[PDB]
């Protein structure tokens with residue numbers, strides 16, 4: 001890599017790893033469209049396995065960007081409409097609070113207070129139906145944003161229903177394979193387990209547990225190389241040959257709602273570039289990112305703005321990830337770690353790197 005990129009990345013990430021006691025980390029910088037890779041530390045402390053460019057990390061909520069794009073692709077295919085009522089794809093959802101709740105509301109956390117987590121008690125499909133039937137909204141649809149796995153998770157499950165494919169099969173054939181993300185998985189195959197990093201929580205090696213709607217809300221594992229390719233694809237969707245996928249990427253970066261200085265896409269979240277770093281850094285703390293906040297509808301949604309800071313944080317019990325990119329500058333970053341360390345530390349490091357390069 002250019003010594004500029006090397007010095008900028010190392011001077012930022014080295015203190016971050018020491019301050020946060022991160023066992024292993026991989027970083028990709030996309031600069032003028034090309035990726036540059038950096039790795040540190042251990043994928044498996046006990047077996048002394050280093051992080052490499054082939055190490056798989058749990059993406060956590062960064063998975064929601066894949067779900068948003070897969071949904072965008074289903075829209076582009078004409079299989080679903082974001083204006084469709086939820087009940088069009090789940091007719092068994094007969095309880096009256098669902099009147100007026102559309103797929104858009106599910107995709108953007110604005111259905112009226114769906115909870116952050118699906119209860120652990122829920123497992124079978126009938127458990128899930130019962131949960132949603134019994135759920136009582138605190139707010140009318142489209143008035144408040146409350147970040148929720150039970151919201152975008154249901155969107156992902158419903159979005160693939162007309163295709164007849166399972167969510168995993170749809171993701172594989174319509175997103176992963178066209179983009180040549182050949183080391184990106186919802187379920188890690190036995191052949192790839194050698195590369196699956198352990199996560200570390202209170203010093204214990206952990207992997208994400210199965211849960212309802214896990215594939216759709218937090219289920220993807222990927223390498224730093226595939227994630228850099230994911231950033232490149234979202235930076236320049238028009239270079240993608242599959243038409244509905246190119247269109248779906250664009251739909252996921254449209255601005256549907258505004259709260260404060262941030263705009264809600266499908267999975268992706270966006271701010272106008274240049275950004276106030278304190279806005280994205282402090283805004284990434286869970287104190288703000290998970291709070292109930294009033295939203296203004298963007299009527300109609302703004303198409304993908306090239307002069308945006310587009311990003312998503314993600315975590316599981318043992319992992320912490322961040323992706324941010326600026327289409328106007330052909331500039332982006334992926335940070336994958338096998339510890340869940342605080343969101344503001346992620347965004348601060350990413351902004352330092354990208355600001356120095358733009």
Ligand SMILES: O=C(O)[C@@H]1CCCCCC[C@@H]1NS(=O)(=O)N1CCCC1
Pocket residue numbers: 060061062116149208217218286290313314315316317
């Ligand atoms: O990634 C995140 O940013 C979310 C933030 C929501 C509140 C904190 C928990 C972390 C969470 N991860 S998760 O919701 O995707 N998923 C839940 C079970 C395992 C991982």
